[PDB]
């Protein structure tokens, strides 16, 4: 078997173990702040520097992974609390889309909402152009911000949120669990054939965006990960 595992209790701008793209910054408290509040159509992303091999061209085997992370989103005067954070998987050469308008694209898609990635978004603004639900929601995205499936959710300002994600390669199922502020959990699962949607080696990371009037604090507090690919 081939395993990739890491853990971040804190983040440091200097550490090369992570790629910083766009407006991302690292606060003195070790928190990764994805977007710049004083910028229009801001976009910031972070990827685990080491590309992870999710499937073998020799066997056809796809890896399973268990990952958990905690983030925080807080409102600011005077802007709509937008746009949200998305935990994504993409080609290792992934970079913020050219001419990104941020906002509802969440830093991973073009204006039409399309891009090459698979992710779990924590959306805090209803974009009708991307067919978003009416309330805050968590969604499974496959090459588009027009979610394959979504689930009602509530983004509480200044609340630490914990997420646990399990991908089981045999059933090709991606299961998510979000632990809210009131103590309630919110789950969402979807079958997604990663090998069919993504290349052999990829990068995992987070992205967040904003617009002219849509802005809020997007923070990544921690992140643990373990992927295992059967090589036999």
Ligand X SMILES: OC[C@H]1O[C@@H](O)[C@H](O)[C@@H](O)[C@H]1O
Ligand Y SMILES: CC(=O)N[C@@H]1[C@@H](O)[C@@H](O)[C@@H](CO[C@@H]2O[C@H](CO)[C@H](O)[C@H](O)[C@H]2O)O[C@@H]1O
What residue numbers does the annotated binding site for Mn(2+) cover?
Answer: 121, 123, 132, 137
**Alpha-carbon torsion angle 93, 94, 95, 96, nearest 10:** 170
What residue numbers does the annotated binding site cover?
Answer: 121, 123, 125, 127, 132, 137
Binding-site string for a copy of itself from residue 51 to residue 70, where x marks contact by CB under 8 A and - marks none: xxx--x-x-----xxx----
Residue 125 lies near ligand X (rule: CB under 6 A) = yes
Rounded distance between C-alpha atoms, residue 129 and residue 104, angstroms: 9
Using the minimum distance from each CB to a copy of itself, give the nearer residue, 23 or 113: 23
Residue 104 lies near ligand Y (rule: CB under 6 A) = yes
Residue 34 lies near ligand Y (rule: CB under 6 A) = no
Residue 132 lies near Ca ion (rule: CB under 5 A) = yes
Rounded distance between C-alpha atoms, residue 152 and residue 159, angstroms: 17
- For 179, residues 6+ apart whose C-beta sits below 8 A from its C-beta are 161, 162, 163, 185
Taking the complex as a whole, the smallest distance from the CB of residue 215 to ligand Y amounts, in Å, to 8
- For 189, residues 6+ apart whose C-beta sits below 8 A from its C-beta are 140, 173, 174, 175, 176
- Footprint of Mn ion (CB under 5 A): 123, 132, 139
Binding-site string for a copy of itself from residue 160 to residue 199, where x marks contact by CB under 8 A and - marks none: x---x-xxxxxx-x-xxx-x--xxxxxxxxx---------
**Binding footprint of ligand X on the chain (CB under 6 A):** 80, 82-83, 103-104, 125, 127, 210-211, 213-214
């Amino acid at each position: 078997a081939e395993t990739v595992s890491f853990n971040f209790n804190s983040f440091s701008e200097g550490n090369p173990a992570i790629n910083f793209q766009g407006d991302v910054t690292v606060l003195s408290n070790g928190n990764i702040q994805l977007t710049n509040l004083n910028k229009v159509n801001s976009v910031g992303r972070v990827l685990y520097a080491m590309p992870v091999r999710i499937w073998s061209s020799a066997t056809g085997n796809v890896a399973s992974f268990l990952t958990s992370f905690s983030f925080e989103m807080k409102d600011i005067k005077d802007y709509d609390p937008a746009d949200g954070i998305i935990f994504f998987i993409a080609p290792e050469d992934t970079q913020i889309p050219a001419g990104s308008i941020g906002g509802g694209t969440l830093g991973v898609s073009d204006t039409k909402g399309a891009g090459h990635f698979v992710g779990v978004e924590f959306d805090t603004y209803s974009n009708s152009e991307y067919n978003d639900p009416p309330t805050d929601h968590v969604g499974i995205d496959v090459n588009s911000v027009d979610s394959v499936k979504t689930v009602p959710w509530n983004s509480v300002s200044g609340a630490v949120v914990k997420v646990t994600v399990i991908y089981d390669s045999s059933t090709k199922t991606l299961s998510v669990a979000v632990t809210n502020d009131n103590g309630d959990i919110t789950t969402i699962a979807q079958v997604v054939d990663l090998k069919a949607k993504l290349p052999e080696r990829v990068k995992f990371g987070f992205s967040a965006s904003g617009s002219l009037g849509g802005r809020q604090i997007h923070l990544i507090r921690s992140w643990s990960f373990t992927s295992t690919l059967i090589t036999t």
